[PDB]
């Protein structure tokens, strides 16, 4: 026999190990691979698909209503419409999105984010709103003047129903942790900032028209987005074995 010296690690079962092992059916010949549409090779292909943000997560909103950002005819100027931390993996409106679910399967992320909004009022309903991304350092902007100093887009309601605000990757490090859990890891260190929306002018409507309307909010990863360090999704759990 060839002299050998076995080392530490011998006999261990590392769940992420990658060895060759004897097959239970050495001569088995599988069915042929047939042509099936929709092959996916990497989940980055999935997170780049836009999905709805559960943005109106308040007590008064149940089910489907939670996807609608309320808009209404104002009687004052420069008012706020919504606010949200842009971090894709933290608990909140983003957690149930495609981007959020996969981000929650990982410990770190990087990349620009695509936040698209679609106005759903009547054809006659007009308006202009400003959507801004505030890079980290302080608290969310308190008014439109402060918000507009950051990255932003001014959206004019019209034939093209939607607008995109790209939250560009602006970070000190190449990656950020996906959680902002503070008590233990002090990961608040990684906060990516805020996205806020304000009336640029006002929502305006004709006589007897609905004075309230909705905006749907979509989010997806941009082409420079990636994830690292797989981890179990915190949303999937159980008590005893299922029967």
């Amino acid at each position: 026999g060839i002299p050998t010296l076995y080392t530490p690690g011998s006999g261990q079962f590392l769940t992420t190990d990658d060895f060759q092992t004897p097959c239970m059916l050495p001569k088995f010949q599988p069915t042929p691979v047939i042509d099936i549409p929709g092959e996916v090779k990497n989940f980055l292909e999935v997170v780049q698909v836009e999905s709805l943000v559960e943005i109106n997560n308040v007590e008064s909103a149940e089910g489907v209503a939670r996807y609608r950002i309320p808009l209404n005819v104002q009687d004052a100027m420069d008012g706020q419409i919504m606010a949200l931390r842009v971090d894709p993996g933290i608990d909140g409106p983003m957690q149930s999105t495609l981007l959020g679910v996969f981000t929650r399967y990982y410990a770190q992320w990087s990349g620009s984010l695509d936040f698209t909004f679609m106005f759903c009022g009547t054809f006659m309903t007009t308006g202009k709103v400003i959507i801004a991304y505030t890079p980290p350092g302080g608290d969310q902007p308190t008014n439109r003047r402060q918000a507009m100093l950051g990255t932003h887009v001014v959206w004019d309601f019209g034939l093209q129903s939607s607008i995109t605000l790209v939250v560009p990757w602006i970070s000190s490090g190449h990656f950020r942790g996906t959680t902002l859990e503070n008590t233990i890891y002090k990961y608040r260190y990684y906060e990516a900032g805020y996205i806020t929306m304000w009336y640029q002018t006002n929502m305006v409507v004709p006589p007897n028209f609905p004075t309230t309307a909705s905006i749907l909010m979509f989010v997806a990863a941009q082409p420079n987005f990636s994830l690292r360090i797989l981890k179990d999704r915190p949303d999937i759990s159980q008590e005893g074995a299922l029967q």
Partner: protein, 244 residues
């Protein structure tokens, strides 16, 4: 000019067999997974009998009974091929054969006025299970041409998030923008062909995410109509007619 300027024209015409569908307020056309329907390759096939390919007799548009967008409307869905299992020669070929394979062209219609607002998600979901009940009722898993009303739209009737249904081929009918949605769907399955009376490959859902509202006094009766055409179909295993 559309292909030159790089935009999609809002008008469209869909012609299959003896049927032609037009719309003047479309929002492009979706082709599921970027794949048009295709015939079964000799290298993927397993059933050895020469297939029946009905052509225009089955590959044409079939319009189903309309559904009203009521105030409490939660959405509606139709299973495919279930919904057309008893319509025209498509239905007959489906019944007389053990095996079926085919794609689809779906056109959902809902017009209102520039005085109305509302938004419908029109999505074609592969292998969409109606599993909100401990023991799913056949009336809900296979509602036929009438389709079935949604009872749990937020959870998409299957325990997932409605907002993530966008991962499946879809379009929206946002009244201020368009009055129709069009989806071309290829055959999808883990098999070359399957039984059209035991398995529904796709489920078409029309779900209101932004409720229908309008200027006071406007027409309140707004229907939603679905017109579906089988495309590139083939059948094997001929025998007497059998329905589920």
């Amino acid at each position: 000019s559309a292909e030159a300027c790089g935009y999609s024209d809002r008008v469209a015409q869909l012609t299959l067999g003896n049927s032609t569908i037009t719309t003047q307020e479309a929002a492009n056309i979706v082709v599921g997974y970027g794949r048009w329907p295709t015939s079964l390759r000799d290298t993927d096939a397993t059933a050895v009998d020469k297939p029946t390919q009905p052509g225009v007799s089955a590959e044409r548009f079939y319009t189903l009974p309309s559904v009203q967008w009521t105030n409490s409307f939660k959405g509606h869905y139709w299973k495919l091929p279930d919904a057309l299992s008893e319509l025209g020669l498509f239905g007959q070929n489906l019944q007389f054969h053990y095996l079926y394979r085919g794609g689809w062209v779906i056109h959902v219609q809902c017009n209102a006025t520039k005085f109305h607002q509302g938004t419908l998600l029109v999505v074609a979901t592969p292998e969409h299970k109606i599993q909100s009940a401990e023991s799913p009722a056949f009336a809900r898993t296979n509602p036929g041409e009438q389709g079935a009303a949604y009872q749990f739209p937020f959870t998409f009737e299957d325990g997932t998030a409605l907002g993530n249904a966008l991962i499946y081929p879809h379009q929206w009918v946002n009244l201020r923008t368009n009055n129709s949605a069009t989806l071309v769907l290829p055959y999808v399955n883990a098999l070359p062909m399957d039984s059209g009376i035991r398995h529904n490959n796709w489920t078409l859902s029309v779900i209101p995410i932004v409720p229908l509202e309008y200027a006071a006094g406007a027409t309140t009766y707004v229907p939603i109509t679905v017109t579906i055409a089988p495309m590139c179909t083939e059948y094997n295993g001929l025998r007497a007619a059998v329905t589920q």
